[PDB]
Each structure stands twice: as structure tokens, then as C-alpha cells.
Amino acid sequence: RFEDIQAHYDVSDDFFALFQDPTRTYSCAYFEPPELTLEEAQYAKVDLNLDKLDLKPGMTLLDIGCGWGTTMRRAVERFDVNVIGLTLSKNQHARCEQVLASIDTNRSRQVLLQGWEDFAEPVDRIVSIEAFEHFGHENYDDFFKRCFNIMPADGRMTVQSSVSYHPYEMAARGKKLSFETARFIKFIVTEIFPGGRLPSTEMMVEHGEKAGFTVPEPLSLRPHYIKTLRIWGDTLQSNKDKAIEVTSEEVYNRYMKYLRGCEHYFTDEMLDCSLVTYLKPGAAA
Ligand SMILES: Cc1cc2nc(N)[nH]c2cc1C
Numbered sequence: 066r067f068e069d070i071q072a073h074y075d076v077s078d079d080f081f082a083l084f085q086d087p088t089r090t091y092s093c094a095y096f097e098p099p100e101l102t103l104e105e106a107q108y109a110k111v112d113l114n115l116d117k118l119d120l121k122p123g124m125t126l127l128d129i130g131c132g133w134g135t136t137m138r139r140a141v142e143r144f145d146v147n148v149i150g151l152t153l154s155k156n157q158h159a160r161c162e163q164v165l166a167s168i169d170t171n172r173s174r175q176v177l178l179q180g181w182e183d184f185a186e187p188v189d190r191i192v193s194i195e196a197f198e199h200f201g202h203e204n205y206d207d208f209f210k211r212c213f214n215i216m217p218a219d220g221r222m223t224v225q226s227s228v229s230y231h232p233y234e235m236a237a238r239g240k241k242l243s244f245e246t247a248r249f250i251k252f253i254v255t256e257i258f259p260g261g262r263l264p265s266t267e268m269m270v271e272h273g274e275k276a277g278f279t280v281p282e283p284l285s286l287r288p289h290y291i292k293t294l295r296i297w298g299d300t301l302q303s304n305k306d307k308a309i310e311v312t313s314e315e316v317y318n319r320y321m322k323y324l325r326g327c328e329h330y331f332t333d334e335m336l337d338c339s340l341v342t343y344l345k346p347g348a349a350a
Pocket residue numbers: 195196198199227253254258261262263327336
């Protein structure tokens with residue numbers, strides 16, 4: 066019923082290749098230093114996350130929403146860790162198995178076509194980059210409980226997610242822009258990421274705390290997502306003819322509206338992107 070209707074907004078991987086960097090990373094890049102290319106910035110964002118997790122050789126890293134396996138490969142090469150990836154995409158599953166098999170290592174590498182709900186194996190650390198927007202508000206308590214329970218006493222997790230604000234969090238300016246932002250968010254979670262639901266930073270923090278995690282000050286990636294969306298927009302536009310051939314004028318116009326729109330609402334500070342760290346009680350100092 067709902068599975069069938071949402072399929073209308075399926076877009077071929079070929080289309081995404083006409084705006085993303087060569088790693089096909091579909092998340093906020095990290096321009097530190099500011100001079101980095103998009104591709105360099107995507108590796109920098111992976112490092113930003115992994116560097117927060119206190120990874121030691123022989124640990125197992127869980128990647129929840131492991132995409133094309135860029136994060137897991139980087140984790141194996143830099144930290145000499147075992148990796149388990151979760152994805153719902155058959156295409157990403159096959160690509161991840163090949164990426165991980167390519168690696169010159171004796172470390173265990175596993176990728177699973179399943180959600181976090183089905184995953185209940187012990188792991189040392191957890192990374193999740195822009196998968197959280199799909200989980201749904203009713204599932205946040207189960208998600209943080211699962212993540213707490215599968216990790217050892219010194220466990221750590223990062224969740225990177227786009228966020229909005231509740232009107233109760235906003236002054237007169239934000240409240241007045243709330244209707245326009247809410248209508249744009251509805252478009253994103255209907256036509257770009259079907260079934261999606263944006264949290265707030267406050268929700269991401271308070272749900273982690275309720276599960277027993279210590280939550281330091283979240284990092285805002287807002288200026289980095291503005292730069293990311295600018296490059297994605299400029300690249301898609303430079304590839305207009307090829308993008309329309311691969312899909313349609315409708316699909317091209319849809320993603321230009323998405324990319325230009327997100328850059329606008331990030332700039333107007335009605336959207337944010339939070340990298341939140343979750344530390345278990347026994348986490349190393
Ligand atoms: C996966 C996802 C990414 C997003 N990026 C922005 N700006 N909104 C979003 C919503 C969802 C569901």
C-alpha cells in the first residue's frame with residue numbers, strides 16, 4: 066500500500082552520479098580546511114565522525130546506514146577495526162561487499178541487508194551518517210536503547226542528522242518562517258526521502274540521555290551543508306541535459322528545488338545539521 070506509492074519517487078543511481086562527488090556520498094561534507102574539494106570534504110566528514118569514537122585495533126564498528134561503504138573502508142584502513150554495515154539497499158549491499166573484500170586486511174567485514182531493529186550483536190562503537198531522518202519519532206526510544214545495549218561499558222556512538230526546530234524553540238522570526246519551512250520539509254519527506262521525519266537537535270540529545278548516554282554539545286555542520294548543497298546544485302545544473310535524459314524534466318526540476326531550497330533554509334537558519342556524540346557511562350575520558 067505505502068511501499069507501492071513511495072516507489073514513484075525512486076530515482077536511478079545514474080542520476081545521483083550527476084551531482085555527487087566520485088564517492089557518491091549523499092550527506093553533508095566537512096570543508097576543514099575550507100580549500101578541500103567536495104570529495105576531500107566527504108573523506109574529512111568520515112574522519113570527523115570516526116575520530117570521535119575512541120576506536121582501538123580489533124574493536125568492531127557498526128555503521129547504521131552504511132551507504133556505498135566509504136565509512137567502513139576508511140575505519141578498517143585508519144583504525145584496524147572489524148566492521149558491520151546495515152543498509153536497506155540491495156545495490157549498496159553488493160557494492161559494500163566488493164569495497165570491503167578489496168581491502169588488504171584480516172579484519173572481519175560484514176554488510177547486512179537489514180535495519181537496526183533486526184540487529185542485536187555485540188559491537189564496540191556505532192556510526193550513523195544521515196540515516197536517522199528515516200527512523201520516525203515513535204522509534205527513537207527503541208533506537209537509543211538498542212545502541213546502548215549492544216555496546217560495552219566504554220561504548221560511543223555518533224549520529225549525524227539534518228534537523229528542524231519546534232515552534233516552541235523559536236522566537237517571533239522563526240515562528241513566522243515555520244509555515245514555509247514546514248511546507249518545504251513536507252516536500253522533502255514526500256518526494257526526496259519518502260517516509261522521512263526530521264528530528265530536532267533537542268530530540269536527538271534528550272532521547273540519547275533517556276537511554277543513559279552522556280551527550281556533549283552537538284556540532285552544527287550548517288555552514289558545511291550550505292557549501293555542500295551549493296556544489297550539488299551547481300553540478301546538477303551543469304549536467305541538466307544528461308540528468309533529463311537519465312530521468313525527466315520533472316525529476317531534474319524536483320532535485321534543483323530540493324538542493325536550492327535546502328541551501329536557502331539552511332542559510333535562513335530554519336534547518337540545521339547536528340553531529341551528536343553519545344558516550345556510555347564507562348566511556349574513556
Ligand atoms: C535522509 C534525509 C536527508 C535530509 N537532508 C535534509 N536537508 N532533509 C532531509 C530528510 C531526510 C529523510
